[PDB]
Amino acid sequence: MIKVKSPGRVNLIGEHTDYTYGYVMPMAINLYTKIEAEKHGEVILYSEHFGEERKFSLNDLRKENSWIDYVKGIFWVLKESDYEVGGIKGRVSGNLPLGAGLSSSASFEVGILETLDKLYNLKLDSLSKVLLAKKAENEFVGVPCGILDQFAVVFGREGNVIFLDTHTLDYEYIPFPKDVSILVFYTGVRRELASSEYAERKHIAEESLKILGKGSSKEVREGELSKLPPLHRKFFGYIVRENARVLEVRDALKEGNVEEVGKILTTAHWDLAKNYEVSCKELDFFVERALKLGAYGARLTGAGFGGSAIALVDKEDAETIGEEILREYLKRFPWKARHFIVEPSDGVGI
Numbered sequence: 001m002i003k004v005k006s007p008g009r010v011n012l013i014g015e016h017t018d019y020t021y022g023y024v025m026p027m028a029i030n031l032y033t034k035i036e037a038e039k040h041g042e043v044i045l046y047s048e049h050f051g052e053e054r055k056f057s058l059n060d061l062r063k064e065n066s067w068i069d070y071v072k073g074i075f076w077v078l079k080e081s082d083y084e085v086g087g088i089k090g091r092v093s094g095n096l097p098l099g100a101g102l103s104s105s106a107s108f109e110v111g112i113l114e115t116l117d118k119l120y121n122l123k124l125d126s127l128s129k130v131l132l133a134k135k136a137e138n139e140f141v142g143v144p145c146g147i148l149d150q151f152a153v154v155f156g157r158e159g160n161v162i163f164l165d166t167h168t169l170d171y172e173y174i175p176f177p178k179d180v181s182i183l184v185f186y187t188g189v190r191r192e193l194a195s196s197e198y199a200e201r202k203h204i205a206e207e208s209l210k211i212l213g214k215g216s217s218k219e220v221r222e223g224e225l226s227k228l229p230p231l232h233r234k235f236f237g238y239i240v241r242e243n244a245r246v247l248e249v250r251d252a253l254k255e256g257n258v259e260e261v262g263k264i265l266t267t268a269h270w271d272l273a274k275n276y277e278v279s280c281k282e283l284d285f286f287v288e289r290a291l292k293l294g295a296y297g298a299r300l301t302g303a304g305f306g307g308s309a310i311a312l313v314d315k316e317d318a319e320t321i322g323e324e325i326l327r328e329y330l331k332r333f334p335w336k337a338r339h340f341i342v343e344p345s346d347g348v349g350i
């Protein structure tokens, strides 16, 4: 029997940049999918979240339109990439909330991959783990996504965020400040409802790159955007400013300038809300109130349209701010909102 712990993730800055090969800055967080498993002739897994066992023969990588598809996708990508692995039997648990925008998909996928890597001695390198997991999600599960989530879950390091160039896959660890907490606020609005909106943004951005004759948004300046159609131009304008914001956060973090990091996150949030049109009133409520209550800055994290937001707050104030906002929020909105205090953590391992 082996036990794997696979973290979720939060993106600090660099939202909706990964599918145009821009800059991102995620961290693994200390909320986890846990998998305890051993070799078996078929695949049998009990999910504590769902309170159920699902199984399949290794022969049977047909989509079933249930959570077991994330497991089949890993077996599929390994087979398609010329690895021979056997079955597993075990239990999936942990404290990472599902469908909250903290990447339980990448957490789970990478956790299963790591379980197979260890049981079957595959000796996968970290980058391979990221690419295989991404490929499973894109091509088997059928969720468009960029590399952000998988990269964080694998490459996370305790006390650090990851500065990543998604075009080249060059990356750098940057220390996160002492006694500054990341307050995570889940709106209780499941973001999966607007997955068509994500696909629309991704498709417009890709089309925009082709119009501009460029391979990455890094190569694009605000002046060239006149060449794009008005809707393409509005959205791409956000992307260009966001790439620049990532580089500024990088410089500010390396100086320990938390106040400036916070200011940039807040600017980014409003740019997302007003120009990229991917926020919602629940998210904006959290951001505005977090700022009034003394956060250095706040921003939605992940795709938007629900899910979670983050606020950078003094460690000794994080619980109080989270509690005060949650209480106000529940009077205003009917959803099962939750708050978590998280810290930058190590990536997947045993």
Ligand SMILES: OC[C@H]1O[C@H](O)[C@H](O)[C@@H](O)[C@H]1O
Pocket (backbone or CB within 6 Å): 011, 014, 015, 016, 017, 018, 019, 144, 145, 146, 147, 148, 149, 302, 303
């Ligand atoms: O930054 C937006 C973010 O949206 C989702 O979380 C995707 O899975 C990521 O790859 C990224 O595109």
